[PDB]
DNA sequence: CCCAGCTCCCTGCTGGCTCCGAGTGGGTTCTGCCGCT
């Protein structure tokens, strides 16, 4: 049944228990932005990483 | 008035040099030291 309206879904749905894994890759360890931060000594371009 | 060097040019081979996808996240170790001057 659709949760929003309570109506049945016309097609029947394949459902059951499946072993799932949480991988170490999490968005909060990847998100990054920069607006004029530190720069390299030799060339004066933004730092890496 | 032919021939053997001699020169000059073209081929073919071998050796030498440069290049080898785009981003991104972590980790670790290493950046000298010893004999005797």
TrEMBL record:
Domain of life here? Eukaryota
List the subcellular locations.
Nucleus
Q: What does this protein do?
A: RNA-dependent RNA polymerase that catalyzes the extension of a non-coding RNA (ncRNA) at the 3'-end using the four ribonucleoside triphosphates as substrates. An internal ncRNA sequence near the 3'-end serves as a template in a single-round Pol II-mediated RNA polymerization reaction. May decrease the stability of ncRNAs that repress Pol II-mediated gene transcription. DNA-dependent RNA polymerase catalyzes the transcription of DNA into RNA using the four ribonucleoside triphosphates as substrates.
Indicate the family of this protein: Belongs to the RNA polymerase beta chain family.
What is this protein's name? DNA-directed RNA polymerase subunit beta
Name the species this protein comes from: Sus scrofa domesticus
Upper classification of the source organism reads:
Eukaryota, Metazoa, Chordata, Craniata, Vertebrata
Range covered out of full length: 1029 to 1077 of 1174
């Amino acid at each position: 049944y659709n949760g929003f309206t309570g109506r049945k879904i016309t097609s029947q749905i394949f459902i059951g228990p499946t072993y799932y894994q949480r991988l170490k890759h999490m968005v909060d360890d990847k998100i990054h932005s920069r607006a004029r931060g530190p720069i390299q000594i030799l060339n004066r371009q933004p730092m890496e990483g």
